[PDB]
Chain length 184, copies 2
């Protein structure tokens, strides 16, 4: 049993959020889609309306094996500015859980809150200067110890598959790659 | 101005629906996400709850440049068994509009309703024998006159980009490919 939190906000990137959620659930994870807004329904960046499983305030004291943050702007900023999600991230980081982000959120969220110290990371290319030079990693997906980052909407499946590999193993990721028809 | 209908159902494939919707809207299309269920909110195959813009009943008499059908099972069957969507598809087909489907839906919906006559098509590989041998096309995305089909979740972005290319032009599709970071 692997448990993952995916926070969602108004103007979250919908391909990225739903790619993460769908792909992990295929692997058998319990994924909790948690709104950082004052409604369960969020209106994502291209107008897709998603009804979250929970408000983040309802799970603030829960523990997850991974917290995986979708991109989108201003979505990433709304995630950044969520006090509850910020507290959860800081606690999960110190507790050795897997912290993950895609697109803007590695810079807007992870780096703003000092969660990438000693690590490398990637992000949607325009955000790569929000990182000090020595923390700029490489790849469409970048693993750095307990940090996993990734670049954008077309890399959201690759991102989630890496998360499967890290949280389960490479054989479980390869099964889910085959389900999605991803050339692994 | 281009207008596109994307029907959604309980147990529609999330990644595929949202990939289509988000990618087309990025191109400037007006996309109408229309539930074939008796609620605007549909519970997709891996539990992602999406609140459709409209019930399909509300737009049955409308005209679209394209109708683009997400996969998922039993989602494709619920689309297949929608009377309203079936009527829309048959009318749009005769009116020379673009009919599109991904994963199961090229077989479960398009072929079931006789919409692929004289055409080639592809689908999630397990469904390729639901097509007569001479209707089996090639590619992860297959264009056949006014039919566009595609194979699965990891091909949903490629699928939608082809839809942009055919409904707009190749230069518009490349712009949207760059936004999503799809190496086109």
């Amino acid at each position: 049993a692997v448990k993952v939190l995916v926070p969602v906000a108004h103007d979250s990137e919908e391909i990225e959020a739903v790619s993460i959620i769908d792909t992990l659930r295929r692997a058998g994870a319990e994924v909790v889609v948690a709104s950082v807004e004052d409604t369960e329904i969020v209106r994502m960046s291209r107008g897709v309306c998603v009804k979250a499983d929970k408000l983040i305030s309802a799970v603030e004291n829960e523990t997850y094996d991974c917290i995986a943050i979708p991109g989108g702007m201003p979505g990433a900023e709304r995630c950044r500015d969520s006090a509850a999600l910020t507290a959860m991230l800081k606690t999960h980081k110190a507790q050795g859980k897997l912290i993950a982000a895609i697109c803007a959120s590695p810079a807007v969220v992870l780096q703003t809150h000092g969660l990438l110290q000693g690590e490398k990371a990637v992000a949607y290319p325009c955000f790569m200067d929000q990182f000090p030079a020595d923390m700029r990693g490489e790849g469409r997906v970048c693993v750095s110890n307990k940090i996993v980052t990734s670049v954008g909407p077309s890399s959201a499946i690759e991102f989630a598959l890496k998360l499967i590999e890290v949280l389960y193993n490479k054989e479980q990721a390869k099964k889910i790659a085959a389900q999605l028809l991803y050339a692994y």
